[PDB]
Amino acid sequence: GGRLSVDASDIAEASRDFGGVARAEPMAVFHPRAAGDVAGLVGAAFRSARGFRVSARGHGHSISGQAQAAGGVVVDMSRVARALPVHSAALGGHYVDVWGGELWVDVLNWTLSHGGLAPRSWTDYLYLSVGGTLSNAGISGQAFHHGPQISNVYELDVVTGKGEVVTCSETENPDLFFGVLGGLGQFGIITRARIALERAPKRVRWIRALYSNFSEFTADQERLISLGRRFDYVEGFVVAASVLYCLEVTKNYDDETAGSVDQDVDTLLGELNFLPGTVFTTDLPYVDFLDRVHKAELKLRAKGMWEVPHPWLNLFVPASRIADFDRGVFRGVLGGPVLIYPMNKHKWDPRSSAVTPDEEVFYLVAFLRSALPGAPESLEALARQNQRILDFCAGTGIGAKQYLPGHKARHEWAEHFGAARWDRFARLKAEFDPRAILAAGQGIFRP
């Protein structure tokens, strides 16, 4: 039922990503109609003499060619009938089956219009595929409480590196299920994901408060994630003044809780140590808050500042070493935001392929800088800054782990996973993709 394409615009899009650096071209782009089409293509790759590379492309948000299939075939997973949300008395909640290539923005609109339901755990940007984020983790301000998106999925349909369609969960083929979650596309292509849902809030009380003291800022973020009155979202960012820290929190509400929202916010804020008179508040619908990054994208696109190189660096930093990151990186080493917020490791299932630091509390530190348009030297200076951040972590023994890892050397991947996790990862590759057909742009395995 699928269609192979050699259209120059199809090839060009499959040969690029948001990073704007890696440009490995496929021989063709495959447009599937259903899961069986994806199975057919991977099956032919597995059966072929040379064993050509096959990679699924979500929305192309990768930084360094992770979705590229050099001289092979890129599967354009972008979008037919959609499954309606379902209630389960056994799970004690709702779920929705979605196509692997579905964008989170389209999942949200579908679930809201069919029962006022929504996923519990997000990414900051909704124009990302379900298969794409589930192959990494999928993190935002809710992860401290609900865990990442890989902790909010009941079941998958996976097309393995042998072109076999497998239904998997915790109780059915758990090795493939847990391997695929945070598995960097190594063990198969997600064609279906069964997403956990909750009754969606109607509105959001979105708060920002400033700190000049890093010790007070991190102490407040750490207390907020341990919280039963609590915020529904906890993030933060580094701002140039010398250096300031912005705490970002939200309180979700609906018609029932509308009458208590003001007091709940005031109570929680009173316990914090932000700078007096630096509180900024917005009240807006739930969809609008979740789509806030798409609004920033439209403004950047109009200024020609979206289709520029993005040498993004994402680190998971153990909370015991975050203090050293202030004078060492934010005041030391250093257009674009620097995100910072802690998460709880216990909300992350240790059976998944996801790699986190060996500490109960760890931070995402996200360097989201854009290079100047049409200026290669800008990208080069930013790449040197990223290497200086990595050298700082190595030289001071910070047990940081990259999120969306950009490694390409075997010993670097071995160090990233550690011996036990590397052994599990390699064994899953021998079982599920022995010819190393899938997601070869990640640069982990060779045929």
Residue 342 tokens read as 């802690």
In the complex, least distance from residue 106 CB atom to ligand FAD, rounded to whole angstroms: 12
Of all residues in the shown chain, the one whose CB is closest to ligand FDZ is 124
**CA 135 – CA 206 distance, rounded (Å):** 29
**CA 25 – CA 39 distance, rounded (Å):** 22
Ligand-binding annotation for 61, yes or no, is yes
Should residue 304 be labelled a site residue for ligand FDZ when binding is judged by CB under 6 A? Answer: no
Should residue 133 be labelled a site residue for ligand FAD when binding is judged by CB under 6 A? Answer: yes
Site string for ligand FDZ, 79-118 (x = CB under 6 A): ----------------------------------------
Ligand-binding annotation for 139, yes or no, is yes
In the complex, least distance from residue 4 CB atom to ligand FAD, rounded to whole angstroms: 18
Candidate list 235, 291, 326, 433, residue with the active-site label: 235
Per-residue b or e along 116-129, where b marks 16 or more CB atoms closer than 10 Å to that residue's CB: ebbbbbbbbbbbbb
**How many CB atoms lie under 10 A from the CB of residue 144?**
25
Q: Please choose, out of 107-115, 129-137, 378-386, 391-399, the segment that lies near ligand FAD by the rule CB under 6 A.
A: 129-137
Residue 378 tokens read as 């800008």
Cβ pair 177, 430 in contact under 8 A: no
Ligand-binding annotation for 129, yes or no, is yes
Should residue 125 be labelled a site residue for ligand FDZ when binding is judged by CB under 6 A? Answer: yes
For ligand FDZ, which residue of 13, 25, 97, 124 counts as binding (CB under 6 A)?
124
**CA 389 – CA 397 distance, rounded (Å):** 12
- Dihedral in degrees, nearest 10, Cα atoms 410, 411, 412, 417: 90
For ligand FAD, which residue of 32, 43, 132, 309 counts as binding (CB under 6 A)?
132
Contacts of 243 (CB under 8 A, 6+ apart): 326, 330, 331
Cβ pair 55, 72 in contact under 8 A: yes
For ligand FDZ, which residue of 337, 414, 415, 434 counts as binding (CB under 6 A)?
337
110 binds, among ligand FAD, ligand FDZ, none (CB under 5 to 8 A by kind): none
For ligand FDZ, which residue of 105, 368, 372, 426 counts as binding (CB under 6 A)?
368
User: What values do phi and psi take at 87, rounded to 5?
Assistant: -100, 140
66 binds, among ligand FDZ, ligand FAD, none (CB under 5 to 8 A by kind): ligand FAD
Residue 193 tokens read as 């994901």
398 binds, among ligand FAD, ligand FDZ, none (CB under 5 to 8 A by kind): none
Should residue 185 be labelled a site residue for ligand FAD when binding is judged by CB under 6 A? Answer: yes
Per-residue b or e along 243-262, where b marks 16 or more CB atoms closer than 10 Å to that residue's CB: ebbbbbbbbbbeeeeeeebe
- Residues annotated as catalytic are 61, 124, 235
Binding site for ligand FAD (CB under 6 A): 18, 55-62, 66-67, 77, 100-101, 123-125, 128-129, 131-133, 135-140, 184-185, 189-190, 404, 439, 441-442
Binding residues for FAD: 56, 58-62, 66, 124, 129, 139, 190, 403, 442
